[PDB]
Amino acid sequence: FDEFPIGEDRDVGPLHVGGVYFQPVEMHPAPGAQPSKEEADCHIEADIHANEAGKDLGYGVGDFVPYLRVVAFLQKHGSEKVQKVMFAPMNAGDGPHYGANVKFEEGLGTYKVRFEIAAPSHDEYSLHIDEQTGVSGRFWSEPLVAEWDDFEWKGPQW
């Protein structure tokens, strides 16, 4: 299926982050707050894999990084309104990603698109820290940010 870029891929902390968008999808179970395939404008996806700095956390470099909490903020140029979109983990035909069906609430135009990526919640993931089997890295405390200041929403490309 056709994917369109949001902007240039970013390397932030131990993460390589890509952003793409494409036609709205039908998800099962549907994230309850996300617009249906009919009501959405598009599906946005954050593709997140460990980079070389991720090795210190125990991830294989290039592997998908699960259990993260990803939120996107969309803000049309010249507007003070900011849309907050919670992404959810899911599999598509091409593997796991974090994503959401969305609506660009202020219509066609240029938007600032920001992904804020939080490490796993305290009780959802652990690291081995003993010298023998452990890792020397640790999860980031402040969310990591990947952003594009001039994304053009020019309507469906499908």
What is the binding site for its own copies (CB under 8 A)?
1, 22-23, 25-31, 37, 43, 57-60, 63-64, 66-67, 88-96, 122-130, 132-135, 138
Q: Are 37 and 82 in contact (CB under 8 A)?
A: no
The three-state (H, E, C) secondary structure of 43-105, written as one string = EEEEEEEECHHHHHHCCCCCCECCCCEEEEEEEECCCCCCEEEECEEEEECCEEEEEEEECCC
Site string for Cl ion, 95-114 (x = CB under 5 A): -----------------x-x
Least Å distance, CB 137 to its own copies, is: 9
Least Å distance, CB 47 to its own copies, is: 13
Nearest CA to 145 among 48, 29, 60? 48
**118 interface partner picked from its own copies, Cl ion, none, CB below 5 to 8 A per type:** none
> How far is it, in rounded angstroms, from Cα 55 to Cα 58?
5
**92 interface partner picked from Cl ion, its own copies, none, CB below 5 to 8 A per type:** its own copies
Binding site for Cl ion (CB under 5 A): 73, 75, 112, 114, 121-122
